[PDB]
Write a protein that binds this ligand. Structure first.
Ligand SMILES: [Zn+2]
Ligand SMILES: [Zn+2]
Ligand SMILES: [Zn+2]
Length: 100
């Protein structure tokens, strides 16, 4: 057998914060808010806060997903109306608990 070469320092070139585009990455997905409207969990939705929801303003509508997801029931219902899969998981959405 044998060994490798000895890593020598001093061959360092000065690095520059240099990127073609400022969009290095996106932001992580959160279930403590409704990603669909991008409003806080179990609270008022997009328009709904401006709209003046007439039921509960504490919570417009919320539903939990078996897939460890949390969205607004309103938002997820519209989503499901057009899509069969989670906006985040890209897996078929399943209702854990929604209530009404
Ligand atoms: Zn929502
Ligand atoms: Zn709503
Ligand atoms: Zn899911």
């Amino acid at each position: 057998g044998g060994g490798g070469t000895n890593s020598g320092a001093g061959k360092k070139r000065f690095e520059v914060k240099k990127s073609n585009a400022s969009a290095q990455s996106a932001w992580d997905i959160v279930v403590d808010n409704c990603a669909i409207c991008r409003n806080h969990i179990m609270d008022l939705c997009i328009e709904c806060q401006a709209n003046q929801a007439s039921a509960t303003s504490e919570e417009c509508t919320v539903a939990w997903g078996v897939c460890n997801h949390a969205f607004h029931f309103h938002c997820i219902s519209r989503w499901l109306k057009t899509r069969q899969v989670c906006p985040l998981d890209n897996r078929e959405w399943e209702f854990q608990k929604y209530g009404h």
